[PDB]
Amino acid sequence: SVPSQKTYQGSYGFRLGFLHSGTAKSVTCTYSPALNKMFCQLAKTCPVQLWVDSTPPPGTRVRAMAIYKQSQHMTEVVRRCPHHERCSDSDGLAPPQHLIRVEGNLRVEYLDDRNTFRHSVVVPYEPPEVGSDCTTIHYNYMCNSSCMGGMNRRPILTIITLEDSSGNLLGRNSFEVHVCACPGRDRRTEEEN
């Protein structure tokens, strides 16, 4: 079946957070609290915060996966468009077909699920850095929502899951994401509508 997208804070009080970045033209990633929706530019840094009430032990892993929002497209694997999946922009770790990457982490791990064929990217959980009360992961989305032959304007969710070293589910959250050229503009537009 389709991966679960049901929210669960779980034992560690797992919640997601996002920078309050506003909607100026220069912004490459902006989150709409009202919409629970991230607007971001292709290949740009996309900070996602992990907030916990208790610290998960080292060995804990954080996985990200994209799925289609509409029920008629839920069974279809979210993947990059032919153009981008053949454009050689791979960092030498990410499979060229994967929509979601993590930048700035040499311990990043990618998975093609042997049964479901779905793509996901995982990193080790690290506790909050100095000066912050949350843990931040920098994601990159390697296709535009507009990309023909890929998402083709079909809305998607990103599902973030907290799992232990043995693969046991600890927590889950999710947010919608729209990859576009003018994220600030799109956020304002969708919030007025």
List residues binding Zn ion (CB under 5 A).
81, 84, 143, 147, 150
* Single-letter amino acid code for the residue at 149: G
Q: Is 73 annotated as a binding residue?
A: no
The answer on whether 182 is annotated among ligand-binding residues is no
> Residue 17 corresponds to which amino acid?
G
Closest CB to Zn ion among 84 and 101? 84
For residues 27 and 81, which CB has a smaller minimum distance to Zn ion in the complex?
A: 81
- What is the rounded distance in angstroms from the CA atom of residue 15 to the CA atom of residue 9? 6
Residue 65 CB, shortest distance to Zn ion, in Å, is 18
Residue among 102 and 143 whose Cβ is closer to Zn ion: 143
Is position 178 annotated in a ligand binding site?
A: no
Nearest to Zn ion of 80, 172 (CB atom)? 80
> Shortest gap between Cβ of 97 and Zn ion (angstroms)?
11
How far apart CA 20 and CA 16 sit, in angstroms, is: 13
Least Å from the CB of residue 43 to Zn ion: 11
Backbone angles phi, psi at 143, to 5 degrees: -145, 150
Sheet arrangement for strand 15-17: 15-17, 46-51, 135-141, 100-102
- At 100, the amino acid letter reads I
Please state the closest distance from residue 41 (CB atom) to Zn ion, in A. Answer: 13
DSSP secondary structure, 70-137, as one string:
SGGGTTSPP---HHHHTS----SSS-TT-SEEE-S-TT-EEEE-TTT--EEEEEE--PPPTT-SSEEE
List the binding residues: 81, 84, 143, 147
Q: Which residues are annotated as a binding site for Zn(2+)?
A: 81, 84, 143, 147
